[PDB]
């Protein structure tokens, strides 16, 4: 009954592929022929942020679209004004291998994590002046890959031992463990209503989970190699996905399948960052050949490139009003584009 | 102990077998309706004049 | 100018830029060494031969005013290709390979590990100081057994020095870049001369960086 | 016709090749941020010292030598020659501090990035420029106010203290002689401090490039000094052809500089091809 | 908690010199900006001195400048006001104030308890008037006070640098409203403030017996910072 359970799994995934084929009645670019394109979208560097020394690994905007967190491997997690390019905090980490960062929707807390297997939660609005390590969450065994805040009270993390988790901050205890991946999960993105979230791992399988129940709702497997970045559509019903086979695909939640693959023949190196615009018409993708491609979300054509980095872009994100897109590479500079 | 692994695996499989899947025409349709309704206030493809771009 | 009182804010910005600069200097005096190797290669023996939370075990010590950070990363039970791109800017990969390479095959496994880690796209110019432990065990193992079990195409004597130089050339033949190099040593009876070897080898790497950084190379 | 026009075309050729080479080195540190460190700051210093020579010091000498005399008056020639010498000595001074920088980088490797910062490199470039200034400018712009007269006529233009012997000895040993022997003794020190010391390119490349640097600097800067020293006594044995070829091959130092100091660096050549592919 | 304990006052002879020492304990003192603010035995506040973080810039009031000096010993975390040539217009209570500045910070958030300098008997600043003298209040009611500047305060960056303090009787001044609408941290929510350009107002809704005292507005657009006269509230 071991191979009987195996062939039963084959039976159910073949009927899933049957349902995905039977619900597929068109292609996406069958419908994009009527909508007029966007043309050349050139964007200038408005600010550059020369603060770090080692390579930058993560960036995250603030919900008032002005402040900014960058976490970089000089052992420094520094938060930034962006209108007048000041630095408003510089927090020295404990372990100088940091592969993620996060910034609270209320703007009070900053999460951090890396190869220390420990997600730290820094308070910012302390009465005593400076910042203090308020919580120190330590439950995984692999490294950390992405952290996001639901509110000031619970944080969902993604790890290197194939698991994700949801922590309660004020207790410091692993409230929920999500598992079901077969490789290292390397991205994370909440819904805009924060009811449910996706995570993409090193086995090309972006899984959609829900934070309230505690186990996987949907699975999407379209890529050929390791998923490295995920962002949602702004309506919450779709999400893009970049991987290290130089392509980035777009999946729907209700249609349960791939919809469109942005991949140009000139490109050979993978993604490190995917985001959207405010309306969702654009898509922003980082790369390893040191430039960032703007894509159409519908017409699948390259609408402009944002080059200007001596090393590969490792973080990217637009604000919550669509005004600017920040990016940050391993050259320690962190650019802003309009 | 492998049969319990396969048991929870096929549990997940038949639990994801029962989700409604609409036609992709309506999915691309309301994606297009969303981008059309929200492209009036997207400051990237319809670029903002520098009276109100705060990164001037 | 016309700044209202946020010139105090840019004073704060200049102050913490100064602090970032000073800590960057103070951490740039350090010398970082990533220690690699397979499981049971003897790397715990060389890290206890330095005489000074389970992801990365760090060992900071110092010797002749050289702060050696030594990152032992063998606790990271995952795929290496997702965190060795943060271990560039290290100045050496210490590499330990045991000399009992006959069983569950090991020196073939250590050989594949070595030429996967030295032909890696990030370590294309970082130089591998290479250690080779368990040498008296190798002496007894050639005193009774042939290690042509590991090397079927080997020609030569069954003595210690020739076999040592043969496996040393086998390891040194695995690199292909001209601007990096491999040092070699034997250990496991060495009472802290290997730390002196680490010191002189890393001074050789630092003067080579100072040569090809100042354009004289 | 043909003689003066092909001389003026090869003159403008070397002038324009020199200035585009130095401005490409200048932008290769300005447009790049990976190369921007202290040793490329000293090569930026050599670049801004040779920029002044590339702008006006070669073409004006060649229009002078196809005219045969100074037609512009005794203030234009003495201030032009004043700035020309002082920036030539500025170039050789920052080249000397480049050599001192390389000696302390190799011989005291673990300590020389600790014993200096960007302020120290600023101290050394500023000391080089002002030491060149206090060497050449008062001795060339006060000398008619010392002797009372202008000993040079309005026809030709040349150093006014050329009839002297002691002060030309004292400035020609100062600007060139002890710099070149100091540079060669510490480059031999570098040549034997860059040894493997444990057990083929390792000393081969360093000996080769310092022999290239030293030989280029000697053959581009020696014979002006020996002509200006023997011309204090052996005046009528000296024609103008030796002056012609001497300044010429001393002015080619500014075009041989970047292919000996900058384009020996591999990443500099890579950024040179980056700016050759934009 | 955080502590600002200052000392060095007394019945001191005029024309001489004194020293005031503010010892601060409970926070990272070396990253704060420090103000010294005095106030008369009958009149309102007035700014006296300010030293930034790391002793970068030092600003004085023009009626005091030259005569006094201000310094800090951040390994000792103390703040010194060394005052010379003391006239009879310096008889005042003096407060040590911490005013950290970055984007979104709350300056003047915490105040010392004041020491007294009672000595014997021996120009285009942005003047700011509180036109109200004092009104009678009662619990259960809501009441709004006003403060009119001379120059418009809404600087080009989009801010409006007006601060509302409350000093309780026999206590130290708390901070109520920072930058004309942002509420302070720890103050109850029943206060609010707004205004436009030059004329501003503070609406306290559902007044209680704890919220009676004197209320000062203060600009922060440029140095010097001058306070209003301060309207007093009184119960029944
Ligand atoms: C450096 C220099 C000196 Cl010091 C010099 O000195 C000439 C001199 O002292 N006397 C004194 C005796 N009188 C008959 C006149 C000649 N004369 C020249 S001519 C020249 C050049 O470049 N001539 C060009 C036309 C070929 C020079 N660089 C040069
Ligand atoms: C280059 N040229 C020789 C034509 C001008 C000059 C000069 C003087 O500069 C110094 N002499 O000895 C070394 C520097």
Partner-chain contact C5 E52, CB within 8 Å:
no
Domain boundary among E64, E94, E120: E120
Minimum-distance ligand 1 atom for the alpha carbon of D69: 25
Same domain, E127 and E112: no
Same domain, E16 and E112: yes
Considering only alpha carbons, which residue of chain C is nearest residue E50?
C8
Chains B and D share 3 or more Cβ pairs within 8 Å: no
Residue A187 is part of which domain span? 1-338
Q: How far is the CA of D44 from the centre of ligand 2 (A)?
A: 20
Domain boundary among E104, E120, E136: E120
Q: Is residue E235 part of a domain?
A: no
Q: Is residue E37 part of a domain?
A: yes
Same domain, E115 and E55: yes
Which two three-digit tokens encode residue D216?
A: 């280029």
Judging by beta carbons within 10 Å of its beta carbon (0-12, 13-18, 19+), is residue D222 exposed, middle or buried? middle
Partner-chain contact A19 B6, CB within 8 Å:
no
Give yes or no for a contact between D218 and D180, defined as CB atoms under 8 angstroms apart.
Answer: yes
Same domain, E127 and E215: yes
- Angle, CA of E104, E107 and E108, to the nearest 5°: 160
Give yes or no for a contact between A203 and A220, defined as CB atoms under 8 angstroms apart.
Answer: no
Of C4, C8, C11, the CB nearest to E221: C4
Give yes or no for a contact between C60 and C69, defined as CB atoms under 8 angstroms apart.
Answer: yes
Distance CA A215, CA A176 (A): 9
DSSP annotation of E79: E
Considering only alpha carbons, which residue of chain A is nearest residue D32?
A310
The CATH number of residue E158's host domain is 2.60.40.10
List the one residue out of B26, B13, B40, B44 whose CA is nearest residue A237: B26
Which helix or strand (DSSP H or E) is residue A259 part of?
strand A258-262
What crossing angle do the helices spanning A2-22 and B2-15 adopt, rounded to 10°? 20
Q: B28: which residues sit within 8 A by CB, 6+ positions away?
A: A26, A28, A31, A259
Instruction: Residue C30: count other Cβ atoms within 10 Å of its Cβ.
Output: 13
Which two three-digit tokens encode residue E105?
A: 């910070």
Distance CA E212, CA E233 (A): 5
- Angle, CA of D32, D38 and D41, to the nearest 5°: 60
Give yes or no for a contact between E135 and E145, defined as CB atoms under 8 angstroms apart.
Answer: yes
Distance CA A256, CA C198 (A): 56
Judging by beta carbons within 10 Å of its beta carbon (0-12, 13-18, 19+), is residue D68 exposed, middle or buried? exposed
User: CA dihedral defined by E121, E124, E126, E131, rounded to 10 degrees?
Assistant: 70
List the one residue out of E134, E136, E139 whose CA is nearest residue E209: E139
List the one residue out of E101, E103, E112, E83 whose CA is nearest residue E22: E112
Q: How far is the CA of D54 from the centre of ligand 1 (A)?
A: 22
Which two three-digit tokens encode residue C33?
A: 């060494």
The CATH number of residue B27's host domain is 4.10.260.10
Same domain, E101 and E183: no
At residue E233, what are phi and psi to the nearest 5 degrees? -105, 155
Partner-chain contact E53 C5, CB within 8 Å:
no
Give yes or no for a contact between A202 and A227, defined as CB atoms under 8 angstroms apart.
Answer: yes
Considering only alpha carbons, which residue of chain B is nearest residue A85?
B55
Domains of chain C: 30-208 (3.40.50.300)
Altogether, the residues listed in chain D come to a count of 278
Which helix or strand (DSSP H or E) is residue A25 part of?
none
Taking a contact as any Cβ pair under 8 Å apart, which residues of chain A between 142 and 201 contact chain B? 180
Which two three-digit tokens encode residue D16?
A: 């324009």
Chains D and E share 3 or more Cβ pairs within 8 Å: no
Which two three-digit tokens encode residue A220?
A: 């999407």
Partner-chain contact E221 C11, CB within 8 Å:
no
Give yes or no for a contact between A279 and B38, defined as CB atoms under 8 angstroms apart.
Answer: yes
Q: Is D71 in a helix, a strand, or coil? A: coil
Three-state DSSP string of D88-148: HHHHHHHHHHHHHHHHHHHHCCCCCCCCCCHHHHHHHHHHHHHHHHHHHHHHHHCHHHHHC
Partner-chain contact D34 A333, CB within 8 Å:
no
* Sign of the alpha-carbon torsion through C190, C193, C198, C204: negative
Give yes or no for a contact between E98 and E22, defined as CB atoms under 8 angstroms apart.
Answer: no
Which helix or strand (DSSP H or E) is residue C145 part of?
none
Residue B11 is part of which domain span? 1-56
Q: C9: which residues sit within 8 A by CB, 6+ positions away?
A: A81, A84, A86, A88, E101, E102, E103
Distance CA A260, CA A27 (A): 8
| Domain count across chain D | 1
The binding-site residues of ligand 2, defined as CB within 6 angstroms of any ligand atom, are D 84-85, 88-89, 92, 175-176, 224-225, 247, 250-251
Judging by beta carbons within 10 Å of its beta carbon (0-12, 13-18, 19+), is residue E186 exposed, middle or buried? exposed
Q: How far is the CA of A306 from the centre of ligand 1 (A)?
A: 59
Q: Is residue E6 part of a domain?
A: yes
Chains C and B share 3 or more Cβ pairs within 8 Å: no
Method: cryo-EM
Distances (CA, A) of C1 to C5, E156, E157: 11, 12, 12
Which helix or strand (DSSP H or E) is residue A59 part of?
strand A56-61
Q: Is D219 in a helix, a strand, or coil? A: helix
- Would you call C183 an interface residue with chain D, using a CB distance cutoff of 8 Å? yes
Binding-site residue numbers of C for GTP are 40, 43-45, 133, 136, 188
Distance CA D211, CA A223 (A): 57
Partner-chain contact D34 A331, CB within 8 Å:
yes
Give yes or no for a contact between E27 and E2, defined as CB atoms under 8 angstroms apart.
Answer: yes
**Residue corresponding to tokens 């006001």:** E81
Task: Tell me which residue has its CA closest to atom 25 in ligand 1.
Answer: D65
Which two three-digit tokens encode residue E16?
A: 């001489």
CA distance C207 to chain D (A): 6
Which two three-digit tokens encode residue E109?
A: 């958030």
Distance CA E165, CA E174 (A): 6
Beta pairing partners, A92: A76
- Angle, CA of A247, A252 and A255, to the nearest 5°: 125
Q: Is A311 in a helix, a strand, or coil? A: coil
Distance CA D75, CA D65 (A): 19
The binding-site residues of ligand 1, defined as CB within 6 angstroms of any ligand atom, are D 65, 68, 156, 158-159, 162, 231, 240, 243-244, 247
- Burial string for A235-262 (b: 16+ CB within 10 Å, else e) reads bebbbbbbbbbbbbbbbbbbbbbbbbeb
CA distance C210 to chain D (A): 6
Distance CA A167, CA A150 (A): 10
Ligand nearest D84 Cα, by number?
2
Distance CA A276, CA A297 (A): 8
Q: Before E195, cis peptide (omega within 30)?
A: no
* Sign of the alpha-carbon torsion through E118, E121, E123, E124: positive
Residue D209 is part of which domain span? 1-278
Q: D8: which residues sit within 8 A by CB, 6+ positions away?
A: D62, D63, D66
Beta strands in C84-178 (DSSP E): 92-98, 128-133
| Domain count across chain E | 2
Judging by beta carbons within 10 Å of its beta carbon (0-12, 13-18, 19+), is residue A304 exposed, middle or buried? middle
Considering only alpha carbons, which residue of chain C is nearest residue D213?
C216
Judging by beta carbons within 10 Å of its beta carbon (0-12, 13-18, 19+), is residue D233 exposed, middle or buried? exposed
Judging by beta carbons within 10 Å of its beta carbon (0-12, 13-18, 19+), is residue A12 exposed, middle or buried? middle
Instruction: Residue C152: count other Cβ atoms within 10 Å of its Cβ.
Output: 6
| Domain count across chain B | 1
The radius of gyration of chain A's CA atoms, rounded to the nearest angstrom, is 20
Distance CA D164, CA A312 (A): 63
Distance CA D19, CA D11 (A): 12
Distance CA D23, CA D17 (A): 10
Partner-chain contact D266 C212, CB within 8 Å:
yes
Give yes or no for a contact between E25 and E82, defined as CB atoms under 8 angstroms apart.
Answer: no
Beta pairing partners, E196: E199
Q: What separation, in Å, do the N-terminal and C-terminal C-alpha atoms of chain B show?
A: 64
Of A57, A143, A184, the CB nearest to C55: A143
Which two three-digit tokens encode residue A46?
A: 């408005």
Q: What separation, in Å, do the N-terminal and C-terminal C-alpha atoms of chain C show?
A: 48
Mutate to test the interface with B, among A22, A239, A300, A338 (most CBs of B within 10 A): A338
Altogether, the residues listed in chain C come to a count of 217
Q: D261: which residues sit within 8 A by CB, 6+ positions away?
A: C215, D43, D46, D98, D213
Partner-chain contact D197 C204, CB within 8 Å:
yes
Q: Is residue E202 part of a domain?
A: yes
Beta strands in chain C (DSSP E): 31-37, 57-62, 67-72, 92-98, 128-133, 182-186
**Residue corresponding to tokens 């040993």:** D173
Of A76, A90, A160, the CB nearest to C78: A160
**Residue corresponding to tokens 């001044």:** E173
Same domain, E134 and E190: yes
Distance CA E3, CA E113 (A): 10
Q: D181: which residues sit within 8 A by CB, 6+ positions away?
A: none
Task: Tell me which residue has its CA closest to atom 2 in ligand 1.
Answer: D158
| Domain count across chain A | 1
List the one residue out of E45, E118, E117 whose CA is nearest residue E82: E117
Distances (CA, A) of E181 to A245, D7, E132, E200: 52, 78, 20, 10
Which two three-digit tokens encode residue B24?
A: 């992709």
Contacts of C212 in chain D (CB under 8 A): 266
- Angle, CA of D95, D98 and D101, to the nearest 5°: 155
Residue E185 is part of which domain span? 121-229
Partner-chain contact A129 E27, CB within 8 Å:
yes
Minimum-distance ligand 2 atom for the alpha carbon of D53: 1
Q: Is residue E129 part of a domain?
A: yes
Same domain, E83 and E135: no
Give yes or no for a contact between A74 and C24, defined as CB atoms under 8 angstroms apart.
Answer: yes
Domain boundary among E79, E100, E120: E120
Strands A282-285, E182-183: parallel, antiparallel or unpaired by DSSP? unpaired
Partner-chain contact A12 B42, CB within 8 Å:
no
Binding-site residue numbers of C are 40, 43-45, 53, 133, 136, 188
Altogether, the residues listed in chain E come to a count of 236
Same domain, E137 and E186: yes
* Sign of the alpha-carbon torsion through C159, C161, C164, C168: negative
Strands E92-98, E34-39: parallel, antiparallel or unpaired by DSSP? antiparallel
Give yes or no for a contact between A284 and A43, defined as CB atoms under 8 angstroms apart.
Answer: no
List the one residue out of C28, C194, C212 whose CA is nearest residue D110: C28
Distance CA E205, CA E139 (A): 10
Taking a contact as any Cβ pair under 8 Å apart, which residues of chain B between 12 and 51 contact chain A? 12-14, 16-17, 19-25, 27-32, 34-35, 38-39, 41-45, 47-48
Same domain, E112 and E160: no
Mutate to test the interface with A, among B3, B10, B28 (most CBs of A within 10 A): B28
Considering only alpha carbons, which residue of chain A is nearest residue C3?
A84
List the one residue out of A306, A276, A60, A231 whose CA is nearest residue B39: A276
Give yes or no for a contact between E28 and A129, defined as CB atoms under 8 angstroms apart.
Answer: yes
The CATH number of residue A190's host domain is 2.130.10.10
Of A235, A281, A338, the CB nearest to B39: A281
Give yes or no for a contact between A143 and A160, defined as CB atoms under 8 angstroms apart.
Answer: yes
Q: Is C114 in a helix, a strand, or coil? A: helix
List the one residue out of A327, A287, A145, A289 whose CA is nearest residue C82: A145
Binding-site residue numbers of C for Mg(2+) are 44, 53
Give yes or no for a contact between A136 and A118, defined as CB atoms under 8 angstroms apart.
Answer: yes
Task: Tell me which residue has its CA closest to atom 9 in ligand 1.
Answer: D162
Partner-chain contact A297 B20, CB within 8 Å:
no
Which two three-digit tokens encode residue A68?
A: 């900014």
């Amino acid at each position: 009954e071991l191979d009987q359970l195996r062939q039963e799994a084959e039976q159910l995934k073949n009927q899933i592929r049957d349902a995905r084929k039977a619900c597929a009645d068109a292609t996406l670019s069958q419908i994009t022929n009527n909508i007029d394109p966007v043309g050349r979208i050139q964007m200038r560097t408005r600010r550059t942020l020369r603060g770090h020394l080692a390579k930058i690994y993560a960036m995250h905007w603030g919900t008032d679209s002005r402040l900014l967190v960058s976490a970089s491997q000089d052992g420094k997690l520094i938060i930034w004004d962006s209108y007048t390019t000041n630095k408003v905090h510089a927090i020295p980490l404990r372990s100088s291998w940091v592969m993620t960062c996060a910034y609270a929707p209320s703007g009070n807390y900053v999460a951090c994590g890396g190869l220390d297997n420990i997600c730290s939660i820094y308070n910012l609005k302390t009465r005593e002046g400076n910042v203090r390590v308020s919580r120190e969450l330590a439950g995984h065994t692999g490294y950390l890959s992405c952290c996001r805040f639901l509110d000031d009270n619970q944080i969902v993390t993604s790890s290197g031992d194939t698991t994700c988790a949801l922590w309660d901050i004020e207790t410091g205890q692993q409230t929920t463990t999500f598992t079901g991946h077969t490789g290292d999960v390397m991205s994370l993105s909440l819904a805009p209503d924060t009811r449910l979230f996706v995570s993409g791992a090193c086995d090309a399988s972006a899984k959609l989970w829900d934070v309230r129940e505690g186990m996987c709702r949907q699975t999407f497997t379209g890529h050929e190699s390791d998923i490295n970045a995920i962002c949602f559509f702004p309506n919450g019903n779709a999400f893009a996905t970049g991987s290290d086979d130089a392509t980035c695909r777009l999946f729907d939640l209700r249609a349960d399948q791939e919809l469109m693959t942005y991949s140009h023949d000139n490109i050979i190196c993978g993604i490190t960052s995917v985001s959207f615009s405010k309306s969702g018409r654009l898509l922003l993708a980082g790369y390893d050949d040191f430039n960032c491609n703007v894509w159409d979300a519908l017409k699948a054509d390259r609408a402009g490139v944002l080059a200007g980095h001596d090393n590969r872009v490792s973080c990217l994100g637009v604000t919550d009003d669509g005004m600017a897109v920040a990016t940050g590479s391993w050259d320690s500079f962190l650019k802003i584009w309009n | 102990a492998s049969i319990a692994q396969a048991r929870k695996l096929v549990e997940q499989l038949k639990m994801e077998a029962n989700i409604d899947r609409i036609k992709v025409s309506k999915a691309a349709a309301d994606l297009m309706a969303y981008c059309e309704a929200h492209a009036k206030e997207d400051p990237l493809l319809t670029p903002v004049p520098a009276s109100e771009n705060p990164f001037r | 100018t016309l700044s209202a009182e946020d010139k105090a804010a840019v004073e704060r910005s200049k102050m913490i830029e100064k602090n970032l600069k000073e800590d960057g200097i103070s951490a740039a005096k350090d010398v970082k060494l990533l220690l690699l190797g397979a499981g049971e290669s003897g790397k715990s023996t060389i890290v206890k031969q330095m005489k000074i939370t389970t992801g990365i075990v760090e060992t900071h010590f110092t010797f002749k005013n050289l702060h050696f950070r030594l990152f032992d990363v063998g606790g990271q039970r995952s795929e290496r290709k997702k965190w060795i791109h943060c271990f560039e800017d290290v100045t050496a990969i210490i590499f330990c390979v045991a000399l009992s390479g006959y069983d569950q095959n090991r020196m073939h496994e250590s050989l594949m590990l070595f030429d996967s880690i030295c032909n890696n796209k990030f370590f294309i110019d970082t130089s591998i100081i290479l250690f080779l432990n368990k040498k008296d065990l190798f002496g007894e193992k050639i005193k009774k057994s042939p290690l042509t079990i590991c090397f079927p195409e080997y020609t030569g004597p069954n003595t210690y020095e020739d076999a040592a130089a043969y496996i040393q050339a086998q390891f040194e033949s695995k690199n292909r870049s001209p601007n990096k190099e491999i040092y070699c040593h034997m250990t496991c009876a060495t009472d802290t001369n290997n730390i002196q070897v680490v010191f002189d080898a890393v001074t050789d790497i630092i003067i080579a960086n100072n040569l090809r950084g100042c354009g004289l190379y | 016709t043909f003689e003066v026009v092909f001389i003026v075309l090869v003159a403008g050729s070397l002038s324009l090749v020199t200035i585009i080479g130095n401005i490409l080195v200048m932008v290769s540190i300005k447009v790049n941020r990976h190369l921007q460190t202290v040793n490329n700051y000293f090569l930026f210093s050599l670049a801004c010292a040779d920029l002044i020579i590339g702008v006006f010091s070669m073409n004006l000498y060649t229009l002078y030598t196809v005219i045969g005399y100074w037609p512009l008056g005794p203030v234009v020639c003495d201030l032009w020659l004043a700035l020309d010498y002082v920036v030539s000595n500025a170039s050789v001074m920052n080249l000397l501090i480049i050599s001192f920088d390389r000696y302390f980088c190799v011989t005291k490797p673990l300590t020389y990035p600790v014993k200096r910062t960007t302020k120290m490199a600023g101290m050394m470039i500023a000391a080089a420029w002002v030491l060149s200034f206090i060497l050449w400018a008062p001795a060339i712009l006060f000398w008619q106010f010392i002797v009372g007269v202008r000993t040079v006529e309005d026809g030709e233009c040349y150093i006014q203290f050329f009839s002297n012997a002691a002060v030309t000895f004292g400035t020609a040993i100062a600007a060139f002689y002890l710099p070149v022997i100091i540079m060669t003794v510490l480059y031999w020190h570098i040549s034997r401090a860059s040894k493997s010391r444990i057990k083929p390119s390792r000393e081969k490349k360093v000996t080769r490039t310092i022999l290239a640097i030293l030989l280029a600097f000697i053959i581009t800067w020696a014979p002006y000094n020996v002509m200006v020293l023997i011309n204090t006594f052996c005046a009528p044995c000296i024609p103008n052809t030796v002056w012609t070829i001497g300044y010429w091959l001393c002015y080619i130092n500014s075009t041989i500089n970047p292919a000996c100091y900058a384009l020996c660096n591999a990443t500099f050549k890579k950024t040179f091809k980056h700016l050759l592919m934009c | 908690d955080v502590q600002l304990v200052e000392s060095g006052g007394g019945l001191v002879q005029p024309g001489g010199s004194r020293k005031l020492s503010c010892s601060a304990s409970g926070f990272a003192f070396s990253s704060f900006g420090m103000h010294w603010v005095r106030q008369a035995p009958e009149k309102g506040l007035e700014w006296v001195a300010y030293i930034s973080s790391g002793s970068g810039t030092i600003y004085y009031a023009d009626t005091v400048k030259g005569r006094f000096t201000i310094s800090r010993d951040d390994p000792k975390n103390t703040l010194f006001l060394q005052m010379t040539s003391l006239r009879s217009e310096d008889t005042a209570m003096y407060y040590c104030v911490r005013s950290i500045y970055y984007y979104g910070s709350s300056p003047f958030d915490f105040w010392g308890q004041g020491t007294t300098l009672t000595v014997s008997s021996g120009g285009s600043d942005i003047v700011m008037t509180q036109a109200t003298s004092s009104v009678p209040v009662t619990p259960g009611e809501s009441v709004s006070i006003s403060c009119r500047s001379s120059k418009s305060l809404l600087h080009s960056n989009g801010n409006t640098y007006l601060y509302w303090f409350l000093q309780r009787p026999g206590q130290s001044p708390q901070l109520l409203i920072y930058r004309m609408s942002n509420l302070a941290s720890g103050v109850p929510d029943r206060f609010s403030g707004s205004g436009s350009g030059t004329a501003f107002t503070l609406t306290i809704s559902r007044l209680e017996a704890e919220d009676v005292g004197v209320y000062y507005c203060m600009q922060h657009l440029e140095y010097p910072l001058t306070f209003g006269a301060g309207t007093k509230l009184e119960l029944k």
